[PDB]
Design a protein around this motif. Structure first.
Motif, PDB file in Angstrom:
ATOM      1  N   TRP A  15       0.826  -1.210   0.000  1.00 35.11           N
ATOM      2  CA  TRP A  15       0.000   0.000   0.000  1.00 35.11           C
ATOM      3  C   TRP A  15       0.848   1.243   0.000  1.00 35.11           C
ATOM      4  N   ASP A  16       2.117   1.148   0.381  1.00 31.95           N
ATOM      5  CA  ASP A  16       2.941   2.385   0.315  1.00 31.95           C
ATOM      6  C   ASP A  16       3.134   2.834  -1.082  1.00 31.95           C
ATOM      7  N   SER A  17       3.674   4.076  -1.229  1.00 31.97           N
ATOM      8  CA  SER A  17       3.798   4.551  -2.590  1.00 31.97           C
ATOM      9  C   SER A  17       4.795   3.797  -3.500  1.00 31.97           C
ATOM     10  N   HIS A  18       4.441   3.720  -4.786  1.00 33.14           N
ATOM     11  CA  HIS A  18       5.247   3.070  -5.830  1.00 33.14           C
ATOM     12  C   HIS A  18       5.637   3.953  -6.988  1.00 33.14           C
ATOM     13  N   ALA A  19       6.899   3.819  -7.426  1.00 33.89           N
ATOM     14  CA  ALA A  19       7.348   4.378  -8.726  1.00 33.89           C
ATOM     15  C   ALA A  19       6.536   3.723  -9.853  1.00 33.89           C
ATOM     16  N   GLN A  20       6.575   2.398 -10.012  1.00 37.64           N
ATOM     17  CA  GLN A  20       5.836   1.867 -11.183  1.00 37.64           C
ATOM     18  C   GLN A  20       5.695   0.413 -10.755  1.00 37.64           C
ATOM     19  N   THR A  21       5.048  -0.368 -11.589  1.00 41.79           N
ATOM     20  CA  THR A  21       4.853  -1.809 -11.344  1.00 41.79           C
ATOM     21  C   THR A  21       5.501  -2.565 -12.486  1.00 41.79           C
ATOM     22  N   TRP A  22       6.195  -3.665 -12.148  1.00 43.40           N
ATOM     23  CA  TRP A  22       6.792  -4.542 -13.159  1.00 43.40           C
ATOM     24  C   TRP A  22       5.887  -5.766 -13.414  1.00 43.40           C
ATOM     25  N   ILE A  23       5.810  -6.198 -14.667  1.00 44.03           N
ATOM     26  CA  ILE A  23       5.049  -7.381 -15.072  1.00 44.03           C
ATOM     27  C   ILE A  23       5.839  -8.078 -16.166  1.00 44.03           C
ATOM     28  N   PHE A  53      -3.497   3.733 -12.986  1.00 46.07           N
ATOM     29  CA  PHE A  53      -3.073   4.174 -11.703  1.00 46.07           C
ATOM     30  C   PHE A  53      -1.624   4.552 -11.643  1.00 46.07           C
ATOM     31  N   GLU A  54      -0.740   3.815 -12.330  1.00 47.38           N
ATOM     32  CA  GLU A  54       0.633   4.183 -12.136  1.00 47.38           C
ATOM     33  C   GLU A  54       1.291   3.548 -13.346  1.00 47.38           C
ATOM     34  N   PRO A  55       2.507   4.041 -13.682  1.00 48.46           N
ATOM     35  CA  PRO A  55       3.326   3.574 -14.823  1.00 48.46           C
ATOM     36  C   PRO A  55       3.574   2.061 -14.836  1.00 48.46           C
ATOM     37  N   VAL A  56       3.378   1.481 -15.992  1.00 44.01           N
ATOM     38  CA  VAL A  56       3.737   0.048 -16.050  1.00 44.01           C
ATOM     39  C   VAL A  56       5.009  -0.309 -16.786  1.00 44.01           C
ATOM     40  N   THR A  57       5.970  -1.100 -16.153  1.00 41.12           N
ATOM     41  CA  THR A  57       6.983  -1.652 -17.017  1.00 41.12           C
ATOM     42  C   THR A  57       6.783  -3.143 -17.303  1.00 41.12           C
ATOM     43  N   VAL A  58       6.402  -3.452 -18.561  1.00 41.57           N
ATOM     44  CA  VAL A  58       6.312  -4.823 -19.034  1.00 41.57           C
ATOM     45  C   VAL A  58       7.705  -5.234 -19.617  1.00 41.57           C
ATOM     46  N   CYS A  59       8.070  -6.537 -19.464  1.00 42.50           N
ATOM     47  CA  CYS A  59       9.302  -7.058 -19.986  1.00 42.50           C
ATOM     48  C   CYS A  59       8.924  -8.319 -20.758  1.00 42.50           C
ATOM     49  N   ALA A  60       9.462  -8.480 -21.974  1.00 46.19           N
ATOM     50  CA  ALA A  60       9.143  -9.664 -22.843  1.00 46.19           C
ATOM     51  C   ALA A  60      10.439 -10.218 -23.405  1.00 46.19           C
ATOM     52  N   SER A  61      10.423 -11.523 -23.665  1.00 45.68           N
ATOM     53  CA  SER A  61      11.655 -12.133 -24.194  1.00 45.68           C
ATOM     54  C   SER A  61      11.925 -11.599 -25.567  1.00 45.68           C
ATOM     55  N   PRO A  62      13.153 -11.816 -26.081  1.00 43.31           N
ATOM     56  CA  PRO A  62      13.537 -11.371 -27.431  1.00 43.31           C
ATOM     57  C   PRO A  62      12.561 -11.839 -28.478  1.00 43.31           C
ATOM     58  N   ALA A  63      12.167 -13.121 -28.430  1.00 44.78           N
ATOM     59  CA  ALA A  63      11.232 -13.629 -29.466  1.00 44.78           C
ATOM     60  C   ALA A  63       9.879 -12.906 -29.441  1.00 44.78           C
ATOM     61  N   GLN A  64       9.361 -12.706 -28.216  1.00 46.74           N
ATOM     62  CA  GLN A  64       8.113 -12.052 -28.000  1.00 46.74           C
ATOM     63  C   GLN A  64       8.069 -10.603 -27.987  1.00 46.74           C
ATOM     64  N   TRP A  65       9.221  -9.954 -28.011  1.00 48.10           N
ATOM     65  CA  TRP A  65       9.176  -8.489 -27.803  1.00 48.10           C
ATOM     66  C   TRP A  65       8.274  -7.700 -28.807  1.00 48.10           C
ATOM     67  N   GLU A  66       8.385  -8.010 -30.080  1.00 47.15           N
ATOM     68  CA  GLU A  66       7.583  -7.252 -31.039  1.00 47.15           C
ATOM     69  C   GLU A  66       6.097  -7.479 -30.801  1.00 47.15           C
ATOM     70  N   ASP A  75       2.002   3.919 -24.058  1.00 51.43           N
ATOM     71  CA  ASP A  75       2.133   4.397 -22.669  1.00 51.43           C
ATOM     72  C   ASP A  75       2.729   3.268 -21.706  1.00 51.43           C
ATOM     73  N   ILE A  76       2.620   2.007 -22.142  1.00 54.67           N
ATOM     74  CA  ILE A  76       3.229   0.889 -21.332  1.00 54.67           C
ATOM     75  C   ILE A  76       4.653   0.675 -21.879  1.00 54.67           C
ATOM     76  N   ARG A  77       5.664   0.813 -21.002  1.00 56.05           N
ATOM     77  CA  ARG A  77       7.045   0.683 -21.383  1.00 56.05           C
ATOM     78  C   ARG A  77       7.289  -0.802 -21.683  1.00 56.05           C
ATOM     79  N   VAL A  78       7.896  -1.160 -22.806  1.00 57.63           N
ATOM     80  CA  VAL A  78       8.161  -2.566 -23.081  1.00 57.63           C
ATOM     81  C   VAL A  78       9.641  -2.661 -23.238  1.00 57.63           C
ATOM     82  N   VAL A  79      10.211  -3.531 -22.403  1.00 62.91           N
ATOM     83  CA  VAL A  79      11.678  -3.722 -22.395  1.00 62.91           C
ATOM     84  C   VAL A  79      12.027  -5.159 -22.745  1.00 62.91           C
TER      85      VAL A  79
END
Ligand SMILES: [Mg+2]
Length: 365
Positions: A15-23, A53-66, A75-79
């Motif tokens: 419940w405390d404050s967050h910079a962003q959420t990772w998925i 609610f807050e910035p999302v950082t999604v991460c995907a494998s090389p094959a899946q990135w595109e 607006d969702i950061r994809v790394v």
């Protein structure tokens, strides 16, 4: 091997404050039916819901990135990040903050796919071993490494001295067999900054593959108040686990001296693997079986806390889905509850929404 306690850091509550959420992003065919397209759709909805609610950082494998970059709004950061599965709650860094080198750190626990070579969920977790360090190294956040096995889904906190855990997972021979409860306990006091502990005997019925991590069993809803997976059907194998945990919690006093108030959060009707869903799984010899008729481990306690947001599951039992939302709304009056339809699609692989997320706390100043 310096500890976080020596530097002032500890782990804050959800419940405390967050910079962003990772998925992360699902891919493997032996765990995600239909080339994972159904779950990719649900992961993508989860990441869009949390971004309101807050910035999302999604991460995907090389094959899946595109594929992930095309599915998700810009607006969702994809790394790019290689992983062996997509449960970042458990391979993600557990972030910790200091009150007075940055003001945020993160612990990288050891991992073995929920038990290892003979009792884990898959046979190769080498990429999963670097996701902890890759995230903190991409954020330029200091990394405390631990050689002990531990998953973020197996540890909760109230941000005030009370770490909540499960004997089934933490004291399991597939985890840290040569550690007693006091050793492991002493590491958690040092690394999470906690003083006291609440041990519930077991995880949720049907979570035997992951050894029953706590976030499908019980969490805090705020200090001194935990939500508990519940049923009144005495014929369900879950009832004796719920009543057992209710006994334990109702005699529990937290680190700040409060009597624990348990709110019951009723599981949906029993859910079961179907032949249509099982036959979509590709059997390759690298992951555990997924069979029709299965008791999917499904509970509403496995939601996420974002900045004034509650990301909760919807499993398809319309009566239990509506009653969980009523329960949750009555509980986070300062957040907005949002539901994720087709929650059952990430639960076919044994997890759900909290399971797939890694909060990054806002850095103090
Ligand atoms: Mg790690």
């Amino acid at each position: 091997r310096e500890s976080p306690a020596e530097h002032g850091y500890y782990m804050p509550a959800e419940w405390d404050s967050h910079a962003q959420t990772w998925i992360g992003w699902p891919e493997r065919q032996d765990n995600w039916r239909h080339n994972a397209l159904p779950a990719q759709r649900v992961f993508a909805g989860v990441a869009k819901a949390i971004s309101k609610f807050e910035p999302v950082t999604v991460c995907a494998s090389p094959a899946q990135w595109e594929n992930a970059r095309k599915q998700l709004p810009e607006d969702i950061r994809v790394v790019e990040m290689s992983m062996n599965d997509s449960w970042f709650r458990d391979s993600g860094p557990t972030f910790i903050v200091r009150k007075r080198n940055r003001n945020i750190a993160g612990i990288d626990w050891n991992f073995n796919a929920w038990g290892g070579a003979n009792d884990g969920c898959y046979n190769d977790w080498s990429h999963d071993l670097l996701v902890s360090r890759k995230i903190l190294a991409l954020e330029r956040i200091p990394r405390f490494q631990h050689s002990m096995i531990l998953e973020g889904g197996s540890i909760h906190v109230d941000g005030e001295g009370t770490c909540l855990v499960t004997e089934e997972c933490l004291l399991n021979k597939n985890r840290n067999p040569h550690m007693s409860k006091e050793q492991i306990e002493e590491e958690l006091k040092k690394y999470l900054g906690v003083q006291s502990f609440i041990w519930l005997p077991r995880g949720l019925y049907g979570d035997e593959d992951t050894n029953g991590h706590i976030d499908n069993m019980c969490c805090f809803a705020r200090p001194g108040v935990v939500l508990l997976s519940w049923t009144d059907d005495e014929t369900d194998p879950q009832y004796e686990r719920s009543v057992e945990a209710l006994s334990v919690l109702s005699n529990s006093i937290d680190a700040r001296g409060r009597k624990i108030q348990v709110i019951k959060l009723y599981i949906p009707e029993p859910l079961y693997m179907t032949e249509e869903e099982s036959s979509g799984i590709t059997q390759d010899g690298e992951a555990i079986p997924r069979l029709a008729g299965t008791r999917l481990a499904a509970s509403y306690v496995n939601f996420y806390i974002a900045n004034g947001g509650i990301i909760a599951p919807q499993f398809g039992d319309p009566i239990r889905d509506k009653e969980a939302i009523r329960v949750l709304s009555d509980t986070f009056p300062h957040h907005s509850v949002v539901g994720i339809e087709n929650a059952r699609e990430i639960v076919l692989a044994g997890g759900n929404i909290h399971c797939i997320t890694q909060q990054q706390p806002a850095e103090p100043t």
